Design a protein around this ligand. Sequence first.
Ligand SMILES: O=C(NO)c1ccc(C[N+]2=c3ccccc3=[SH]c3cccnc32)cc1
Ligand SMILES: [K+]
Ligand SMILES: [K+]
Ligand SMILES: [Zn+2]
Length: 362
Amino acid sequence: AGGSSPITGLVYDQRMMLHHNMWDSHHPELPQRISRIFSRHEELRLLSRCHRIPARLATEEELALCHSSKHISIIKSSEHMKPRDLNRLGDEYNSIFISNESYTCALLAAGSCFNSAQAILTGQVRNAVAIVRPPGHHAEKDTACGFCFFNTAALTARYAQSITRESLRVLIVDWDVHHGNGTQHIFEEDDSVLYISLHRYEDGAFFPNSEDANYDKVGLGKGRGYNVNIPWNGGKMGDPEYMAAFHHLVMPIAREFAPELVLVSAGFDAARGDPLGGFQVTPEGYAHLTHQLMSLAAGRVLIILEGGYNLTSISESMSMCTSMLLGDSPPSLDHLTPLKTSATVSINNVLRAHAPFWSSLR
Ligand SMILES: O=C(NO)c1ccc(C[N+]2=c3ccccc3=[SH]c3cccnc32)cc1
Ligand SMILES: [K+]
Ligand SMILES: [K+]
Ligand SMILES: [Zn+2]
């Protein structure tokens, strides 16, 4: 009564470390990714400031919100498979490794986010951070892809609608350096879930190597205008470019959409130091992206870990985000390189594509 200071949730469970690559212990999608981030939260005295949200398993019925019965069944069967067959099954997909613990970990990643979304939407917490693996955004309705088995962010959007209202407007912002092909396709015809992705594109030569990630992909049917791809070509982008895309595109569209819940597909592989992305976003940059998103949806933001492969970089970057969620003042941008010419070209292409659908851009 009379109001109270908002609460930030945090979910992290050591069981999700059990998923591993038994043939290549140096695969970039390391168990230590989540434990290193969690450990960094302890060092910075952030953990004791958060309300700890328990993990749980997703149910098979919940997985069916976005995935086919065949795909659920095949991944489910892998918990009991012998080593020879786990390799063959993983090799049936584009860049997937599987262990006997993989299925359970994917359930825990989804269920952790379901509990966090439920806590946000019932007012137990204002916002939350989800330190989960394996990632989700490359997972399609009928197939796994790119280290992802089930589409955690997409599943969380549908779960939120199931416990509130079907038309509940969910914004998913995907700032992982890779395009979230799976999230886009699930919602491509859906005007109740706005998907905005920023990603390295290089004319379709960057993973996942599909022209579906280009700016002219605006959605289908009633979903026209509700899929916003911001593709980067020719240059290692960093804080200046992401701040410009947010100023000119992400925030105007989002504010016009007026989301009631914000999910962040928060990969940190666009971070300085990341050997898969080649970009230059700093921890302070991620903090400012988080702070701008906190102005939406009455502050109902859920940050879901996706990719990010430099353990030091992801730990500092993700901890910067939680600090913002807790209400700390955003840090000053040390460096401020003039923006790249090619980032303006990309931004202007998206503007000319989405101006027919959004008055805030005209
Ligand atoms: O989910 C990601 N990030 O968040 C993600 C998903 C798939 C890939 C594919 N893959 C790999 C795959 C395994 C180990 C190292 C690499 S390097 C690379 C370069 C160019 C194309 N594919 C590549 C990469 C990243
Ligand atoms: K992305
Ligand atoms: K959409
Ligand atoms: Zn990625």
